[PDB]
């Protein structure tokens, strides 16, 4: 018998743990910011017909540069954000995880650093470390929003190669205004990745509007996993100056996007009008969930996303388990006193709110 | 409009070029070692029916550890190679490319070295460089087979962290015997990755037979892209001791494999006997094609896979263009004097041979 210690693993990986956010198939899943609506019957029918069409070519490598997908992503972005862009501005990969991985390979890596404003996305420091990019954590303010004075101070001092700005922020829910983003971009010496995973849930404009002004610095990261109700298709993308697409083509694995993934994403995008109608339903439930939590006595952080950050427990993890014992799976992001609940369909939110009503009395 | 030089791209990527065969819409495509047979109607019908079933779950993240897929991959390997394995021995990713990338992340990387036997697969050094692993090229012999005295000498001298052995080799087609593989393993200090992408095309035993004997050293890399007739699905995997699965779980992107990828590979696996029946036809066609090339007066390296390496042109790129002009797309693998043709269906091979006969008279 042998174990991992008997293998020539890289030393810095010793004692590490695999990213392991709970993935459980329970009845009430409010833990991964997934859109709670199953894909529409129309979408599914289209998907089934498309697979029937393209299945006979699955012996061949897919189209390497995903041109058709990128055309449709650029058409979406043009309509969605109002900024005219073409496939030359767009690059797709297997989720934002791989998008970001590729950007880190090309613009981070050994000898370089990435700066983020914590608490933010769990994956950013994980991907940074995974690409041998040093991660600098700069703390957000007491209200969980970016503290601009410290932000600009620290960027000036450290000259980071990459700066992450997540807006709306996961886990806190707040939008960093475009004027603040410009301020960040102007002190940034290398590139700035604006992670717009939740943009569709905010009325506020996309950082894509800033791309004309900062071609050499700005990349806008997006995904189909959240508002677009397609996390299982693993499709993330960025919008930037065409030079950046040339950049990532040097590091991307050839044929990194399969034929079914490209075709599935295309089908999804041509059903966007109906699907994105879920964003409106979710925003109404968010307002209701947040209101009710406040009414109960919870400290609720205002949000422009599909989730709510709320506290203040003495032990968030015990609180988290207490929700789970009542069939409600939310998220413990390892921030003292707080948990993140994803907005579900009404009946899931009712179950979460019923659990939360009972749990506040426990004083956990 | 800006230049790549205006972006802060890492310096080693400066003046580099993107990898990949030209995507040319020709009648006879014999450039990427794809199985030329379309997926069977039985497989396609199963796929479509399965998509109809799972598509309703696509708003959720896919099963992260790909347990079902790995179960079926283990079943396939057990039957195919005669070595009893389970899912604990199997790991799947988006192509062999991602599999090798992940192995290089965990066992190669900054400060470490990979060693290969050139000419072999183009992506081994490319992936090495992309993961900041130093690549050591050791020349194969005049017969394009591994020169074992030179191989063992250089492994002892260099003490490389990773050794690549591709068998059958791409682009030359030769099998390195398991006895020679064993000798390499015994001098190799770190890990040995046996790239068995074309294993199914040879009756010779798989290196999976050596796994029980060298558990801390050996990983057998495999794919569904070639004999398994499923390159469009981008599914590669490895067979190894379960400690290796623990290792790559520290470096893989979570949810790296999509719901559709997983489900489609599962469908493909349960149609394996029918699909892999095509190997017989292709192995006999290879012999026909290679024999006719020698009749014509070409220099052919003996192959045991679905392609044939041949020469000796004064300018093989010009020879490549002549084939293209006659409607036949083969591969210029960057080796002076030689080109690599994939074995197609009989009518495709006939066209390749017709063109090859005109071209030899041109003395290119």
PDB file of C-alpha atoms in Angstrom, chain A residues 2-4 6-11 13-23 25 29-39 43-44 47-49 51-53 55-65 94 97-98 101 104-112 121 123 126-127 130-132 161 189-191 215-217 223 225-226 229-234 241 243-261 264 348, chain B residues 1-4 6-23 29-30 32-39 43-45 47-49 51-53 55-65 94 97-98 101 104-112 121 123 126-127 130-132 161 189-191 215-217 223 225-226 229-234 241 243-244 246-261 264 348:
ATOM      1  CA  UNK A   2       1.146   3.568  -0.813  1.00  0.00           C
ATOM      2  CA  UNK A   3      -0.272   7.078  -0.210  1.00  0.00           C
ATOM      3  CA  UNK A   4       0.198  10.654  -1.515  1.00  0.00           C
ATOM      4  CA  UNK A   6       5.036   8.344  -1.229  1.00  0.00           C
ATOM      5  CA  UNK A   7       4.626  10.326  -4.506  1.00  0.00           C
ATOM      6  CA  UNK A   8       6.979  13.048  -5.781  1.00  0.00           C
ATOM      7  CA  UNK A   9       4.297  15.746  -5.393  1.00  0.00           C
ATOM      8  CA  UNK A  10       5.544  19.362  -5.490  1.00  0.00           C
ATOM      9  CA  UNK A  11       6.471  20.295  -1.907  1.00  0.00           C
ATOM     10  CA  UNK A  13       1.208  21.103  -2.450  1.00  0.00           C
ATOM     11  CA  UNK A  14       1.953  18.961   0.630  1.00  0.00           C
ATOM     12  CA  UNK A  15      -0.751  19.261   3.284  1.00  0.00           C
ATOM     13  CA  UNK A  16      -3.018  21.168   0.873  1.00  0.00           C
ATOM     14  CA  UNK A  17      -6.736  20.429   0.581  1.00  0.00           C
ATOM     15  CA  UNK A  18      -8.736  20.302  -2.661  1.00  0.00           C
ATOM     16  CA  UNK A  19     -11.290  23.117  -3.067  1.00  0.00           C
ATOM     17  CA  UNK A  20     -14.261  21.298  -1.589  1.00  0.00           C
ATOM     18  CA  UNK A  21     -17.292  23.513  -1.146  1.00  0.00           C
ATOM     19  CA  UNK A  22     -20.156  21.147  -0.279  1.00  0.00           C
ATOM     20  CA  UNK A  23     -22.037  19.735  -3.267  1.00  0.00           C
ATOM     21  CA  UNK A  25     -28.248  16.884  -3.726  1.00  0.00           C
ATOM     22  CA  UNK A  29     -30.122  24.041  -2.568  1.00  0.00           C
ATOM     23  CA  UNK A  30     -29.291  27.672  -1.931  1.00  0.00           C
ATOM     24  CA  UNK A  31     -25.522  27.385  -1.733  1.00  0.00           C
ATOM     25  CA  UNK A  32     -23.739  27.938  -5.092  1.00  0.00           C
ATOM     26  CA  UNK A  33     -25.536  30.964  -6.598  1.00  0.00           C
ATOM     27  CA  UNK A  34     -27.060  28.749  -9.276  1.00  0.00           C
ATOM     28  CA  UNK A  35     -30.190  29.978 -11.023  1.00  0.00           C
ATOM     29  CA  UNK A  36     -32.990  27.921  -9.398  1.00  0.00           C
ATOM     30  CA  UNK A  37     -35.027  27.539 -12.577  1.00  0.00           C
ATOM     31  CA  UNK A  38     -34.469  24.434 -14.622  1.00  0.00           C
ATOM     32  CA  UNK A  39     -33.811  25.136 -18.319  1.00  0.00           C
ATOM     33  CA  UNK A  43     -34.360  25.348 -24.644  1.00  0.00           C
ATOM     34  CA  UNK A  44     -34.190  21.607 -23.928  1.00  0.00           C
ATOM     35  CA  UNK A  47     -30.691  21.234 -27.317  1.00  0.00           C
ATOM     36  CA  UNK A  48     -31.940  17.721 -28.111  1.00  0.00           C
ATOM     37  CA  UNK A  49     -32.497  18.602 -31.805  1.00  0.00           C
ATOM     38  CA  UNK A  51     -27.292  17.137 -30.528  1.00  0.00           C
ATOM     39  CA  UNK A  52     -29.132  15.008 -33.064  1.00  0.00           C
ATOM     40  CA  UNK A  53     -27.660  17.253 -35.802  1.00  0.00           C
ATOM     41  CA  UNK A  55     -23.587  14.002 -32.988  1.00  0.00           C
ATOM     42  CA  UNK A  56     -22.468  12.489 -36.330  1.00  0.00           C
ATOM     43  CA  UNK A  57     -19.372  14.728 -36.320  1.00  0.00           C
ATOM     44  CA  UNK A  58     -18.250  13.925 -32.720  1.00  0.00           C
ATOM     45  CA  UNK A  59     -15.371  11.852 -34.082  1.00  0.00           C
ATOM     46  CA  UNK A  60     -13.756  15.066 -35.312  1.00  0.00           C
ATOM     47  CA  UNK A  61     -12.041  17.696 -33.240  1.00  0.00           C
ATOM     48  CA  UNK A  62     -14.240  20.698 -32.535  1.00  0.00           C
ATOM     49  CA  UNK A  63     -13.752  24.030 -34.215  1.00  0.00           C
ATOM     50  CA  UNK A  64     -10.656  25.168 -32.283  1.00  0.00           C
ATOM     51  CA  UNK A  65     -11.342  28.890 -32.014  1.00  0.00           C
ATOM     52  CA  UNK A  94     -14.747  26.020 -19.636  1.00  0.00           C
ATOM     53  CA  UNK A  97     -12.308  29.164 -13.751  1.00  0.00           C
ATOM     54  CA  UNK A  98     -10.499  28.371 -17.021  1.00  0.00           C
ATOM     55  CA  UNK A 101      -6.587  30.411 -15.289  1.00  0.00           C
ATOM     56  CA  UNK A 104      -3.135  34.238 -15.013  1.00  0.00           C
ATOM     57  CA  UNK A 105      -0.890  32.056 -17.219  1.00  0.00           C
ATOM     58  CA  UNK A 106      -0.433  34.879 -19.713  1.00  0.00           C
ATOM     59  CA  UNK A 107      -0.270  37.880 -17.364  1.00  0.00           C
ATOM     60  CA  UNK A 108       0.552  36.466 -13.897  1.00  0.00           C
ATOM     61  CA  UNK A 109       2.677  33.456 -13.022  1.00  0.00           C
ATOM     62  CA  UNK A 110       6.105  33.080 -11.339  1.00  0.00           C
ATOM     63  CA  UNK A 111       7.591  36.381 -10.128  1.00  0.00           C
ATOM     64  CA  UNK A 112       4.264  38.226 -10.486  1.00  0.00           C
ATOM     65  CA  UNK A 121     -14.480  35.142  -4.629  1.00  0.00           C
ATOM     66  CA  UNK A 123     -11.545  30.932  -6.518  1.00  0.00           C
ATOM     67  CA  UNK A 126      -6.998  29.464  -5.487  1.00  0.00           C
ATOM     68  CA  UNK A 127      -6.431  30.067  -9.191  1.00  0.00           C
ATOM     69  CA  UNK A 130      -2.535  27.329  -8.947  1.00  0.00           C
ATOM     70  CA  UNK A 131      -0.785  29.419 -11.620  1.00  0.00           C
ATOM     71  CA  UNK A 132       2.168  30.261  -9.290  1.00  0.00           C
ATOM     72  CA  UNK A 161       0.594  42.724 -12.152  1.00  0.00           C
ATOM     73  CA  UNK A 189       0.341  49.064 -13.621  1.00  0.00           C
ATOM     74  CA  UNK A 190      -0.493  45.695 -15.313  1.00  0.00           C
ATOM     75  CA  UNK A 191      -4.046  44.443 -15.994  1.00  0.00           C
ATOM     76  CA  UNK A 215      -7.523  48.830 -24.074  1.00  0.00           C
ATOM     77  CA  UNK A 216      -4.151  47.803 -22.600  1.00  0.00           C
ATOM     78  CA  UNK A 217      -5.341  47.267 -19.004  1.00  0.00           C
ATOM     79  CA  UNK A 223     -20.195  33.657 -17.169  1.00  0.00           C
ATOM     80  CA  UNK A 225     -23.353  29.884 -14.821  1.00  0.00           C
ATOM     81  CA  UNK A 226     -25.558  32.334 -12.874  1.00  0.00           C
ATOM     82  CA  UNK A 229     -28.938  29.398 -15.867  1.00  0.00           C
ATOM     83  CA  UNK A 230     -26.307  27.144 -17.421  1.00  0.00           C
ATOM     84  CA  UNK A 231     -23.674  26.330 -14.748  1.00  0.00           C
ATOM     85  CA  UNK A 232     -23.701  22.696 -15.892  1.00  0.00           C
ATOM     86  CA  UNK A 233     -22.553  23.728 -19.388  1.00  0.00           C
ATOM     87  CA  UNK A 234     -19.359  25.256 -17.925  1.00  0.00           C
ATOM     88  CA  UNK A 241      -9.392  44.371 -26.798  1.00  0.00           C
ATOM     89  CA  UNK A 243      -4.860  41.865 -28.438  1.00  0.00           C
ATOM     90  CA  UNK A 244      -5.897  39.957 -25.289  1.00  0.00           C
ATOM     91  CA  UNK A 245      -7.470  37.154 -27.360  1.00  0.00           C
ATOM     92  CA  UNK A 246      -4.142  36.825 -29.197  1.00  0.00           C
ATOM     93  CA  UNK A 247      -2.458  36.691 -25.779  1.00  0.00           C
ATOM     94  CA  UNK A 248      -4.583  33.833 -24.364  1.00  0.00           C
ATOM     95  CA  UNK A 249      -4.333  31.827 -27.591  1.00  0.00           C
ATOM     96  CA  UNK A 250      -0.667  31.367 -26.689  1.00  0.00           C
ATOM     97  CA  UNK A 251      -1.588  29.626 -23.394  1.00  0.00           C
ATOM     98  CA  UNK A 252      -4.931  27.937 -24.015  1.00  0.00           C
ATOM     99  CA  UNK A 253      -5.018  24.179 -24.499  1.00  0.00           C
ATOM    100  CA  UNK A 254      -5.892  23.459 -28.113  1.00  0.00           C
ATOM    101  CA  UNK A 255      -9.488  22.325 -28.579  1.00  0.00           C
ATOM    102  CA  UNK A 256     -10.223  23.277 -24.959  1.00  0.00           C
ATOM    103  CA  UNK A 257     -13.945  23.731 -25.749  1.00  0.00           C
ATOM    104  CA  UNK A 258     -15.809  20.621 -26.911  1.00  0.00           C
ATOM    105  CA  UNK A 259     -18.351  20.420 -29.749  1.00  0.00           C
ATOM    106  CA  UNK A 260     -21.321  19.839 -27.362  1.00  0.00           C
ATOM    107  CA  UNK A 261     -20.222  22.674 -25.098  1.00  0.00           C
ATOM    108  CA  UNK A 264     -25.045  23.873 -26.052  1.00  0.00           C
ATOM    109  CA  UNK A 348     -37.311  27.365  -1.480  1.00  0.00           C
TER     110      UNK A 348
ATOM    111  CA  UNK B   1      -5.711  49.220 -32.212  1.00  0.00           C
ATOM    112  CA  UNK B   2      -2.856  48.006 -29.999  1.00  0.00           C
ATOM    113  CA  UNK B   3      -0.082  45.474 -30.264  1.00  0.00           C
ATOM    114  CA  UNK B   4       0.597  42.494 -28.066  1.00  0.00           C
ATOM    115  CA  UNK B   6       1.556  46.998 -25.386  1.00  0.00           C
ATOM    116  CA  UNK B   7       0.136  44.268 -23.093  1.00  0.00           C
ATOM    117  CA  UNK B   8       2.247  43.077 -20.100  1.00  0.00           C
ATOM    118  CA  UNK B   9       2.462  39.513 -21.456  1.00  0.00           C
ATOM    119  CA  UNK B  10       5.031  37.251 -19.790  1.00  0.00           C
ATOM    120  CA  UNK B  11       8.389  37.540 -21.587  1.00  0.00           C
ATOM    121  CA  UNK B  12       8.722  33.883 -22.638  1.00  0.00           C
ATOM    122  CA  UNK B  13       5.439  34.189 -24.560  1.00  0.00           C
ATOM    123  CA  UNK B  14       6.814  37.112 -26.592  1.00  0.00           C
ATOM    124  CA  UNK B  15       7.151  36.251 -30.289  1.00  0.00           C
ATOM    125  CA  UNK B  16       5.432  32.892 -29.779  1.00  0.00           C
ATOM    126  CA  UNK B  17       2.768  31.433 -32.055  1.00  0.00           C
ATOM    127  CA  UNK B  18      -0.479  29.612 -31.358  1.00  0.00           C
ATOM    128  CA  UNK B  19      -0.450  25.866 -31.883  1.00  0.00           C
ATOM    129  CA  UNK B  20      -2.839  24.036 -34.237  1.00  0.00           C
ATOM    130  CA  UNK B  21      -3.298  22.531 -37.705  1.00  0.00           C
ATOM    131  CA  UNK B  22      -4.910  24.832 -40.298  1.00  0.00           C
ATOM    132  CA  UNK B  23      -8.688  24.422 -40.255  1.00  0.00           C
ATOM    133  CA  UNK B  29      -9.093  15.331 -43.976  1.00  0.00           C
ATOM    134  CA  UNK B  30      -6.223  13.133 -42.781  1.00  0.00           C
ATOM    135  CA  UNK B  32      -5.234  14.957 -36.865  1.00  0.00           C
ATOM    136  CA  UNK B  33      -5.373  11.184 -36.244  1.00  0.00           C
ATOM    137  CA  UNK B  34      -9.158  11.147 -35.871  1.00  0.00           C
ATOM    138  CA  UNK B  35     -11.093   7.977 -36.433  1.00  0.00           C
ATOM    139  CA  UNK B  36     -12.783   8.660 -39.841  1.00  0.00           C
ATOM    140  CA  UNK B  37     -15.997   6.792 -39.084  1.00  0.00           C
ATOM    141  CA  UNK B  38     -18.985   8.738 -37.829  1.00  0.00           C
ATOM    142  CA  UNK B  39     -20.429   7.686 -34.481  1.00  0.00           C
ATOM    143  CA  UNK B  43     -24.666   5.609 -30.112  1.00  0.00           C
ATOM    144  CA  UNK B  44     -26.239   8.756 -31.493  1.00  0.00           C
ATOM    145  CA  UNK B  45     -29.800   7.668 -30.568  1.00  0.00           C
ATOM    146  CA  UNK B  47     -26.894  10.236 -26.815  1.00  0.00           C
ATOM    147  CA  UNK B  48     -29.970  12.171 -27.913  1.00  0.00           C
ATOM    148  CA  UNK B  49     -32.168  10.214 -25.488  1.00  0.00           C
ATOM    149  CA  UNK B  51     -29.501  14.595 -23.408  1.00  0.00           C
ATOM    150  CA  UNK B  52     -33.300  14.726 -23.233  1.00  0.00           C
ATOM    151  CA  UNK B  53     -32.957  13.250 -19.739  1.00  0.00           C
ATOM    152  CA  UNK B  55     -30.645  18.640 -19.851  1.00  0.00           C
ATOM    153  CA  UNK B  56     -33.149  19.608 -17.123  1.00  0.00           C
ATOM    154  CA  UNK B  57     -30.253  19.680 -14.602  1.00  0.00           C
ATOM    155  CA  UNK B  58     -27.981  22.077 -16.595  1.00  0.00           C
ATOM    156  CA  UNK B  59     -28.683  25.052 -14.328  1.00  0.00           C
ATOM    157  CA  UNK B  60     -26.723  23.138 -11.662  1.00  0.00           C
ATOM    158  CA  UNK B  61     -23.014  22.587 -11.478  1.00  0.00           C
ATOM    159  CA  UNK B  62     -22.103  19.162 -12.801  1.00  0.00           C
ATOM    160  CA  UNK B  63     -21.088  16.347 -10.472  1.00  0.00           C
ATOM    161  CA  UNK B  64     -17.634  17.521  -9.491  1.00  0.00           C
ATOM    162  CA  UNK B  65     -15.746  14.223  -9.100  1.00  0.00           C
ATOM    163  CA  UNK B  94     -11.089  17.796 -20.997  1.00  0.00           C
ATOM    164  CA  UNK B  97      -4.146  17.843 -22.956  1.00  0.00           C
ATOM    165  CA  UNK B  98      -5.804  18.830 -19.671  1.00  0.00           C
ATOM    166  CA  UNK B 101      -1.431  19.817 -17.914  1.00  0.00           C
ATOM    167  CA  UNK B 104       2.623  18.673 -14.978  1.00  0.00           C
ATOM    168  CA  UNK B 105       1.090  21.100 -12.445  1.00  0.00           C
ATOM    169  CA  UNK B 106       1.325  18.504  -9.661  1.00  0.00           C
ATOM    170  CA  UNK B 107       4.635  16.814 -10.495  1.00  0.00           C
ATOM    171  CA  UNK B 108       6.483  19.254 -12.786  1.00  0.00           C
ATOM    172  CA  UNK B 109       6.410  23.049 -12.599  1.00  0.00           C
ATOM    173  CA  UNK B 110       8.983  25.714 -11.664  1.00  0.00           C
ATOM    174  CA  UNK B 111      12.377  24.237 -10.745  1.00  0.00           C
ATOM    175  CA  UNK B 112      11.519  20.877 -12.311  1.00  0.00           C
ATOM    176  CA  UNK B 121       4.007  14.495 -29.566  1.00  0.00           C
ATOM    177  CA  UNK B 123       2.122  19.091 -26.972  1.00  0.00           C
ATOM    178  CA  UNK B 126       4.274  22.887 -25.252  1.00  0.00           C
ATOM    179  CA  UNK B 127       2.520  21.769 -22.055  1.00  0.00           C
ATOM    180  CA  UNK B 130       3.025  26.309 -20.261  1.00  0.00           C
ATOM    181  CA  UNK B 131       3.387  24.852 -16.754  1.00  0.00           C
ATOM    182  CA  UNK B 132       6.890  26.349 -16.370  1.00  0.00           C
ATOM    183  CA  UNK B 161      11.139  14.760 -12.589  1.00  0.00           C
ATOM    184  CA  UNK B 189      13.657   9.159 -10.359  1.00  0.00           C
ATOM    185  CA  UNK B 190      10.253  10.945 -10.372  1.00  0.00           C
ATOM    186  CA  UNK B 191       7.285   9.832 -12.441  1.00  0.00           C
ATOM    187  CA  UNK B 215       2.764   2.339  -8.110  1.00  0.00           C
ATOM    188  CA  UNK B 216       4.779   5.435  -7.062  1.00  0.00           C
ATOM    189  CA  UNK B 217       6.155   6.149 -10.537  1.00  0.00           C
ATOM    190  CA  UNK B 223      -7.926   9.285 -24.691  1.00  0.00           C
ATOM    191  CA  UNK B 225     -10.247  11.075 -29.201  1.00  0.00           C
ATOM    192  CA  UNK B 226      -8.547   8.572 -31.487  1.00  0.00           C
ATOM    193  CA  UNK B 229     -14.042   7.912 -32.277  1.00  0.00           C
ATOM    194  CA  UNK B 230     -14.932  10.790 -29.938  1.00  0.00           C
ATOM    195  CA  UNK B 231     -12.453  13.687 -30.368  1.00  0.00           C
ATOM    196  CA  UNK B 232     -15.392  16.131 -30.455  1.00  0.00           C
ATOM    197  CA  UNK B 233     -16.204  15.129 -26.835  1.00  0.00           C
ATOM    198  CA  UNK B 234     -12.742  16.066 -25.551  1.00  0.00           C
ATOM    199  CA  UNK B 241      -2.455   4.222  -8.313  1.00  0.00           C
ATOM    200  CA  UNK B 243      -2.602   8.369  -4.742  1.00  0.00           C
ATOM    201  CA  UNK B 244      -2.247  10.065  -8.162  1.00  0.00           C
ATOM    202  CA  UNK B 246      -5.454  12.598  -4.688  1.00  0.00           C
ATOM    203  CA  UNK B 247      -2.556  14.521  -6.283  1.00  0.00           C
ATOM    204  CA  UNK B 248      -4.387  15.944  -9.317  1.00  0.00           C
ATOM    205  CA  UNK B 249      -7.396  16.859  -7.174  1.00  0.00           C
ATOM    206  CA  UNK B 250      -5.201  19.522  -5.575  1.00  0.00           C
ATOM    207  CA  UNK B 251      -4.569  21.145  -8.991  1.00  0.00           C
ATOM    208  CA  UNK B 252      -7.673  20.536 -11.159  1.00  0.00           C
ATOM    209  CA  UNK B 253     -10.185  23.363 -11.698  1.00  0.00           C
ATOM    210  CA  UNK B 254     -13.295  22.434  -9.784  1.00  0.00           C
ATOM    211  CA  UNK B 255     -16.149  21.360 -12.113  1.00  0.00           C
ATOM    212  CA  UNK B 256     -13.638  21.140 -14.955  1.00  0.00           C
ATOM    213  CA  UNK B 257     -15.767  18.497 -16.723  1.00  0.00           C
ATOM    214  CA  UNK B 258     -19.270  19.475 -17.876  1.00  0.00           C
ATOM    215  CA  UNK B 259     -22.536  17.642 -17.328  1.00  0.00           C
ATOM    216  CA  UNK B 260     -22.805  17.000 -21.099  1.00  0.00           C
ATOM    217  CA  UNK B 261     -19.172  15.942 -21.406  1.00  0.00           C
ATOM    218  CA  UNK B 264     -21.796  11.823 -23.522  1.00  0.00           C
ATOM    219  CA  UNK B 348     -10.070   8.597 -48.529  1.00  0.00           C
TER     220      UNK B 348
END
